[PDB]
Amino acid sequence: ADTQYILPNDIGVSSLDSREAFRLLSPTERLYAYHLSRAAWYGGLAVLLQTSPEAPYIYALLSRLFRAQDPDQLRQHALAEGLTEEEYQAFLVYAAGVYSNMGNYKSFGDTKFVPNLPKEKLERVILGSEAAQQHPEEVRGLWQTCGELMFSLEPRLRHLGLGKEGITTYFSGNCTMEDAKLAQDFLDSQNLSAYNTRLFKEVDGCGKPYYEVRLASVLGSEPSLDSEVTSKLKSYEFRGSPFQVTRGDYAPILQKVVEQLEKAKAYAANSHQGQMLAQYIESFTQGSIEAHKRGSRFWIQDKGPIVESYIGFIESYRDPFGSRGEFEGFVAVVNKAMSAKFERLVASAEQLLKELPWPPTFEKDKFLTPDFTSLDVLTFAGSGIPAGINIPNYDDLRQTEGFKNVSLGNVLAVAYATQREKLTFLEEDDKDLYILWKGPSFDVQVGLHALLGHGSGKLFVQDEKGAFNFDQETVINPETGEQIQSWYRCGETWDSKFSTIASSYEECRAESVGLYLSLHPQVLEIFGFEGADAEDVIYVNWLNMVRAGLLALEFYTPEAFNWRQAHMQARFVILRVLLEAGEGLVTITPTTGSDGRPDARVRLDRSKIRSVGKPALERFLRRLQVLKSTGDVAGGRALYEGYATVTDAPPESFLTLRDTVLLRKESRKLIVQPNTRLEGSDVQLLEYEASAAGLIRSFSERFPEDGPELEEILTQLATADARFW
């Protein structure tokens, strides 16, 4: 068992396998990947600022510490100061946690984690460290500032979120959901994207709140060559509230980023790569999302590159309101062999879309030749590494230019490690099938999730004039039978309208498409299973889905009635949909484990998957798309938040089950990533041990040129914003 809000000493650590991918790269491609990786790792540091008030200080402190003394050197100091090996290991694991999450909160669960050792003992180590002897003011200053928050588990600090009972740095501490809604309405009214923005509320002597919308850029208030953004840099009045649009957020960090983007542009393989980089540079320098969208368009047109990459404020999972983006950047190498199955999935893609439970009027008008590749990651900077990505997120680009589907092969391999001892909530005979088919069924689900999942669906949009992108005269809502009553307007996006459930809603729809189309005998041939093998993959994919729905309860907060992770919430919903169908399709039974502790069992009648499960899923999937397409947020919330409701109602009694899920939960593994170094001419790949110490070393060697400078930059930016929290 393991306590909430701490990382266990025996937490799994896996090293990313990137040697063979890197070895295939030409000298030019290596220099390209080198600078892009540097750009990504630089930008990843901003996530610390986007996580918690104390995160940038903690990184700065750990960085100083391990720069003067590596894990084996520090051990000799720490053990001489009274720490046991167990206590030192807890600190190593904590440091690795902060590094891998770019913050002292889990990227997967948004929960705080603290060092599993006495604070006073850790103080002796830090204050007596070699880093402390060399820079006593800096180290004591850092410890004084972030020491308490490093350990504090006060209830309001335990989870990320808006309001008084949660921590967020996307907003000032005094901001609530009301403030976010107001800010979003303002942003939409000015056609300004929330992706690269943060919101700060300050009051005067009269208590009247003033709002600051701050954009992320190198440039500040000073005049620049750009006019599209600088013209927005002014004061506004919106529904009685003062609004000021500023920029300069993470400026010296983004300055490092564009330096490496510029250097990468010297090694671009084609004009599409050169142009997309110049636009990203414009985006990060000026604070223009329009510039980033232009870059994304050029990126989509760069088909099948050897070195694939993307960077910026992309995903909006961590923003409590759900519109602001967290910085991420990745560099990956194309895997020709593993891209085969996904490219033939493209061949039958347009056909399979017609098998989806909604009319073609609710589907994209012009079908675009989709891009689906399997890649090997060299760098994935930010709060975490996904198994697959579907990008860009700009919906207008999605329905005019296209989008890229990416499966991260060497990331998937890390997830393909599950001992049958850890396979909880399954009877014996189901475990065997699970081990055999979890791998292939994932490729199926991920494939459909990406291409036909996120890639399907049309948004009904009315422009500035009364013209629609759909035939409002003949298009009929299949659920109501009436003509289309609601749609998206100018300035409105998926995130802007559905806000807090936008991410989870869409992941649920995507997962449903995958689960739904996994019953198709033809899709089980593109991946090539064909027989009972194909049938087995079906059952396992459905058994894994309903098991994950139970496991999802770890990421629900009863006191706040709040889901903390979009994908897990999505999988719980699907469990609820299948449970709603009744007729003995899926049952959850509270049992007792061999260790005498509370347990549970998930039973799935495989015979009733097609007769009961599919019709229930088909109906659910249809309702999801209709409400999404029509932008029916009220209906969308009523449906989704209804299934996402967690109660101790019989017979399932989920609240009771949750306590069992927490009891037997398994901590997600930490992933160590390699480094690339320049030997003047040649680029070398540096690899590290699959351990906490190894992960620490990988970051210790990650910024050889300007490590101490980044420490000071993060400290400076944090201190400037200290009043907000």
Partner: peptide, 5 residues
């Protein structure tokens, strides 16, 4: 859109 697990 990212895909975890």
């Amino acid at each position: 859109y990212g895909g975890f697990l």
